Design a protein around this ligand. Structure first.
Ligand SMILES: [Zn+2]
Length: 307
């Protein structure tokens, strides 16, 4: 509400409330966080990233995006909690302090703002963007099938009405191209984390091909360590592995694209639960989910600073 200390982190919020939160956080911690506009959505809403930094010039960086699939409301709620947590733990947690003293963090809480507004207004289960194509009355693209990584291959649909429609061409969705351009221009991202729900999975590349990545041994051990840290708070059990061996072939996904740009520490989290509530996770689970997920993310960031 009036301060980030009176904001209710244990309930779900609207787009306007999350955008107001971002401005409160910047006003309270102007030496540590800044708000960047990296584009505008199809319906003209600003696309914002929060940059957390203690200085430097183009320091090596960590990317985290949440909410690319709009109905996965636990992810935007986790992103708000993360933003606050960064500002609380800098100078208090020795390990997070060391990360931010050497690296920058870029956090995109609402990666698909038009879908998110639609889930509040019209259809709680909407997952796609809201772009319109002329050959159909169906709306929207699955923005996690629109990236230039095996685009249009098996594990995505070419039908505009499908929930897994990949779009007309790679990077057709402005929500995806805004990220692509920003990461390419920056050139010094070391980790790329995309957060989803549900199923309790920690995945590494690839989804579009059976080929094993050259860094499989290391990314598998980092994933094991991150799942063990996450489980330590409440006992939540995650599985881990490559996308294609753990779930199924899926093309056009963001961490396949980021790994092929040379961003070695590329992971997707699928948060709680395993299906009892699914996308309609009760608000009473927001803070426990965020707290345990933070331990998993911090484990990946520690490995990145030292490697
Ligand atoms: Zn998702």
């Amino acid at each position: 509400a009036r301060s980030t200390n009176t904001f209710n982190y244990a309930t779900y919020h609207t787009l306007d409330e999350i955008y107001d939160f971002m401005d409160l956080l910047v006003a309270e911690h102007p030496q540590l966080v800044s708000k960047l506009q990296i584009g505008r959505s199809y319906e003209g809403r600003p696309i914002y990233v929060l940059k957390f930094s203690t200085g430097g010039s183009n320091r090596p960086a960590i990317w985290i995006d949440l909410g690319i699939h709009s109905r996965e409301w636990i992810t935007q709620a986790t992103g708000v909690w993360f933003a606050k947590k960064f500002t609380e733990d800098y100078g208090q947690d020795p390990s997070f302090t060391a990360i931010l003293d050497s690296m920058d963090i870029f956090l995109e809480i609402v990666t698909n703002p038009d879908g998110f507004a639609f889930t509040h207004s019209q259809n709680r289960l909407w997952r796609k963007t809201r772009s319109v194509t002329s050959s159909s009355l169906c709306v929207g693209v699955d923005a996690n099938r629109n990236w230039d990584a095996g685009f249009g291959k098996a594990g995505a649909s070419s039908s505009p009405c499908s929930e897994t429609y990949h779009g007309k061409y790679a990077n057709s969705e402005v929500e995806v191209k805004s990220i692509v351009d920003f990461v390419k221009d920056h050139g010094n991202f070391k980790a790329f984390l995309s957060i989803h729900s549900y199923s309790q999975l920690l995945l590494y590349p690839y989804g579009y091909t059976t080929q094993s990545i050259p860094d499989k041994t290391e990314l598998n051990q980092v994933a094991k360590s991150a799942v063990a840290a996450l489980k330590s708070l409440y006992g939540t059990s995650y599985k881990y592995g490559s996308i294609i061996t753990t779930i199924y072939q899926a093309s056009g996904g963001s961490i396949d694209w980021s790994y092929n740009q040379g961003i070695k520490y590329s992971f997707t989290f699928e948060l709680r639960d395993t299906g009892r509530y699914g996308f309609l996770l009760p608000a009473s689970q927001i803070i426990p989910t965020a707290q345990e997920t933070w331990l998993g993310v911090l484990t990946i960031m520690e490995h990145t600073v030292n490697n």
